[PDB]
Enzyme design. Structure first.
Site, PDB file in Angstrom:
ATOM      1  N   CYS A  99       0.845  -1.159   0.000  1.00 52.10           N
ATOM      2  CA  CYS A  99       0.000   0.000   0.000  1.00 52.10           C
ATOM      3  C   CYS A  99       0.900   1.234   0.000  1.00 52.10           C
ATOM      4  O   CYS A  99       1.476   1.630   1.024  1.00 52.10           O
ATOM      5  CB  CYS A  99      -0.893  -0.065   1.242  1.00 52.10           C
ATOM      6  N   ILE A 100       1.051   1.812  -1.178  1.00 55.59           N
ATOM      7  CA  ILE A 100       2.087   2.777  -1.454  1.00 55.59           C
ATOM      8  C   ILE A 100       1.385   3.714  -2.424  1.00 55.59           C
ATOM      9  O   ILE A 100       0.590   3.254  -3.251  1.00 55.59           O
ATOM     10  CB  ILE A 100       3.302   2.038  -2.098  1.00 55.59           C
TER      11      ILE A 100
END
Length: 122
Positions: free
Chosen positions: A90-91
């Site tokens: 999750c970037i």
């Protein structure tokens, strides 16, 4: 034989990566038949939680790439705040809305730059 549109882009990236190898990661196809399913090997950076570690992640491109971002999932166990329990990364570079959002111009190099930075500061 109908060729997925993003194939030429992905092939160019793969070749550019192969001709410009980088310290700290290798990227390739899981299966030569399939340009959309990559694996990335990542060396845990020195003076971090991950030093001494080596990690496999899968980078999977949507058939409408480059308009939509790839998804990344660590396969090797790793602990990081941006990595969930399934391994999914999750970037913000991989979130649809410069490096705080997916833009069609981002390459695998751009993504890995962001991933390496997040490991160098958990």
């Amino acid at each position: 034989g109908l060729v997925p549109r993003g194939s030429l882009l992905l092939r160019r990236q793969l070749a550019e990566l192969n001709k410009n190898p980088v310290e700290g990661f290798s990227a390739g196809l899981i299966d030569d038949n399939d340009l959309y399913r990559w694996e990335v090997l990542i060396i845990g950076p020195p003076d971090t939680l991950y030093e001494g570690g080596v990690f496999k992640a899968h980078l999977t491109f949507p058939k409408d790439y480059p308009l939509r971002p790839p998804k990344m999932k660590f396969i090797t166990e790793i602990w990081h705040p941006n990595v969930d329990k399934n391994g999914d990364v999750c970037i913000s570079i991989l979130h649809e809305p410069p490096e705080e959002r997916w833009l069609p111009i981002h390459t695998v190099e751009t993504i890995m730059i962001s991933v390496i930075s997040m490991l160098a500061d958990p």
